[PDB]
Amino acid sequence: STGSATTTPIDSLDDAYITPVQIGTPAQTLNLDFDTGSSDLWVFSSETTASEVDGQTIYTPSKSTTAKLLSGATWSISYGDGSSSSGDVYTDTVSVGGLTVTGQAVESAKKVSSSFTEDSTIDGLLGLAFSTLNTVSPTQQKTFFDNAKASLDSPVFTADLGYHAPGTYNFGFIDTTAYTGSITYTAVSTKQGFWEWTSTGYAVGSGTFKSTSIDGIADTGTTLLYLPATVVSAYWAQVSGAKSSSSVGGYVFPCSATLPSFTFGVGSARIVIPGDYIDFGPISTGSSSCFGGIQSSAGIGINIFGDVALKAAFVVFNGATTPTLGFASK
């Protein structure tokens, strides 16, 4: 089997991407944030604290004839940006772009943190990291991909994120019309539960390529590109007026600037992020200071190839016995 669904930026900045997901019988369609950096499928629901719901579409398990409470199971998760959610668990039928999984763990939120409440466009998350990170207790649950894998034509899914435009998540096949040149595959470590790999280096604008190993994760659920301070300093040094602001929380630059591109290495191959991709607009409405899309990972503890990097490529998440990651220009 296969699946194919369109993913759409939630706002003019590509802060995140939502993908329609059918849950239950009859289908309840929720717009979920597909996240290759976590492994929980959780949704706003009829059980979510009323004061913490503000415009989201909710899952109502009582209205699904295929919903079953997973007796005694609970979940609780905290993300890298400080946000969090928790609740209990149902199993139900979940379909993504024509691909159907029965008995999927659907984690129902009783509580969500303010940032989730404040984002009316995201009805929940669908985790696509390795199931070892799943937070369901006392019986850990599998991801949608994990549950689908045996059925898929090929044990893969692909991320084709658009820049200020819709894109595509495919399951079970590689669309050879969706990229240019060839796909370059690189090794993955599953030891931290992430799609963790090692970039071969970087370049700033038309500058010479620096060969250097950068260990990081392919994470569709993170907006920006987080890299070592040395690398990020070298990028912003090429932008007149750019500086790191502790008060704003990262590198900012004059909105009148023209940003240089950023290249990262995948084996012998190169992915080029155009400068426009690195512009996240005024730090506050009407300000002439703009927030940078490449930031230091020094505070985080890991490097993150977030949407800024991934949307410049066609990305293959290969879930074979020995998983790998593939990158192509597009």
From Swiss-Prot:
Coiled-coil intervals in this record?
none
In the record, what terms sit under GO molecular function? aspartic-type endopeptidase activity
Q: Does the keyword Plastid apply?
A: no
Q: Which residues form the Peptidase A1 domain?
A: 17-328
This enzyme catalyses: Hydrolysis of proteins with specificity similar to that of pepsin A, prefers hydrophobic residues at P1 and P1', but does not cleave 14-Ala-|-Leu-15 in the B chain of insulin or Z-Glu-Tyr. Clots milk
Q: Which residues form the active site?
A: D35, S199
Disulfide connectivity for this sequence is C255-C290
Q: Which domain of life is it from?
A: Eukaryota
The keyword Disulfide bond is annotated on this UniProt entry: yes
Q: What is its EC number?
A: 3.4.23.22
Q: Which UniProt keywords apply?
A: Aspartyl protease, Disulfide bond, Hydrolase, Protease, Signal, Zymogen
- A single BP term in Gene Ontology: proteolysis
The family note in this entry says: Belongs to the peptidase A1 family.
Mind telling me what this protein is named? Answer: Endothiapepsin
* Organism of provenance: Cryphonectria parasitica
